[PDB]
C-alpha cells in the first residue's frame with residue numbers, strides 16, 4: 026500500500042512557524058529545530074508552503090525563481106538539511122508546486138514583457154483589447170479584472186491572481202517541458218511529493234471564458250505524471266476548489282496516472298450568501314455541513330480514487346472560530362473536529378497550530394491586515410459604499426491572515442516564535458494557547474491529535490475501512506461506522522454547542538472521547554461538542 030494512504034500530513038507555513046535568526050520571519054533552520062516536536066506528534070510528512078525566491082506580493086505564491094530559496098528562509102543548503110534531518114525523524118517533505126503562474130519578476134516574464142517577438146512572449150497569455158476594453162469579463166481572485174494592460178505592447182496579459190502573478194500559457198509545449206524538468210530537479214532531491222497550487226486552472230482557455238476544469242486539464246496532468254513523478258512513489262495532492270467527487274476520482278484514480286488525491290473545498294461556501302462572495306456572510310447550517318462531510322465519504326469510490334481530509338490551511342480561518350466555539354468550549358470543540366475528521370476515510374492534514382486549538386485573530390482596522398486579498402476587498406467595497414464595520418467583520422470571519430499568525434510555542438515574548446517583532450503580530454491569546462502548555466496538560470487538544478494519529482497508524486480499519494452513515498440522527502449529530510471485514514468502529518459527534526439526543530442499539534467499548542467515557546449509547550444526551558470513538562461489540 027502506497028505510503029501516503031497511511032500517513033498524516035502537517036502543513037508548515039514557513040514565515041510564521043519558527044524564527045531562528047532574529048528577523049521576525051520564520052525560516053528553515055527554525056523548522057529543523059522543531060522536528061523533534063513534529064515526530065512526537067507523529068506526523069509522516071510536512072507540506073511546506075512556498076520557500077522559493079519571491080517578491081512576496083502573495084506571500085510566496087508569486088515565485089521569481091523556482092530553483093532558488095528565498096534568502097529570508099535561508100539557503101539551499103538549509104533546504105537540503107531539512108529534507109535530510111526530516112528523513113531521520115521519519116518525515117518526508119512535500120513541496121508546494123506553483124506552476125499556474127509566476128511572479129512578474131520571474132526571468133521568463135521580464136523577458137516576455139520586452140515585446141511580442143521576445144522568445145518568452147508565448148510563455149504567458151497576451152490578448153488585444155476588445156472595443157477599447159479588456160478582452161472579456163474574467164475576474165481576478167484579488168479583486169478587479171483578470172486582465173492587466175501592458176502599455177508598451179498595447180496588449181493585456183492574463184492573471185487570475187495578482188497583477189504580479191502573470192498566468193503561464195500551458196498550451197506552450199516548451200514551457201510545459203521546462204516545468205517538468207524543474208519538477209524533476211526537486212524530485213531528485215528526495216522530496217516526498219508536491220502540493221499543487223490551483224492545479225485545476227492549467228486547462229484554462231480564457232478565449233472561451235474557461236478557467237477551472239478546462240478540457241486539457243487531465244491530459245496535461247497525465248503528461249506531467251509520465252514526465253515527472255509517475256514512477257517515483259511520492260504523494261501528489263492537487264488544490265482543487267472546484268472539484269466534485271467525480272472530478273476528484275478523475276484526478277486520483279490510480280489507473281488514470283494523474284495525482285494521489287485532491288483538496289476539495291465544497292464546505293467553504295456553506296457560510297456565504299448564494300451567488301455572492303465569501304465576504305457576504307451567512308450562518309452555517311450544521312445539517313448542510315453534515316451532508317457535505319457525508320457526501321465525500323460515501324460518493325467517492327475508494328476502489329478507484331483517494332480522498333484528502335482537512336479543516337485548515339493558510340487560506341482559511343481556524344475551524345473552531347469559524348464553525349464552532351473558541352471560548353469556554355474551545356477544547357471540546359477542537360477535539361470534536363479532530364475526532365470526526367481523523368476517523369474518516371482518506372489522508373488527514375493538520376495545519377500548524379490546529380493541534381493546540383489556535384483561534385482566529387480579530388482586527389479592529391485595516392492597518393492591522395497584510396494580505397492582498399483582504400486589503401483589495403476592503404478598498405473596493407469601501408469605494409463602493411459598503412459599511413466599513415462590516416468589512417472589518419468580514420475580514421475577521423473570512424480573512425486569510427487569521428491562518429497566518431505566528432505559531433504559539435510558549436508563553437514567552439511573541440509566544441516563542443521570535444525575539445523581535447514578528448512580520449505579523451502574534452495573537453494575544455498565546456498566553457493560554459501554546460505548545461508548552463498543551464504538552465504539560467494530558468487532557469490537551471495535542472494529545473487528542475497524537476492519539477488519533479497513532480490509532481490511524483496502528484489500525485487498518487481507520488485506513489481502509491468502509492464508511493457507513495448511522496441513519497436518522499439529528500442534523501446536528503454526525504455518527505458513522507468504519508467497517509473492515511468483521512470489525513466495526515462507531516464514531517458519534519455533536520457538531521453543535523448544545524445538547525443533542527442520540528439513540529443506538531450498538532453495544533460499545535469506548536476508545537477515545539473528549540468527555541468522560543460512556544459504556545452505552547442506548548438513549549443519551551450528548552454534551553456540547555461531545556464526540557467519541559467506540560469499538561462495536
Ligand SMILES: [Ca+2]
Pocket residue numbers: 043044045046047048049050051052097
Ligand atoms: Ca528568521
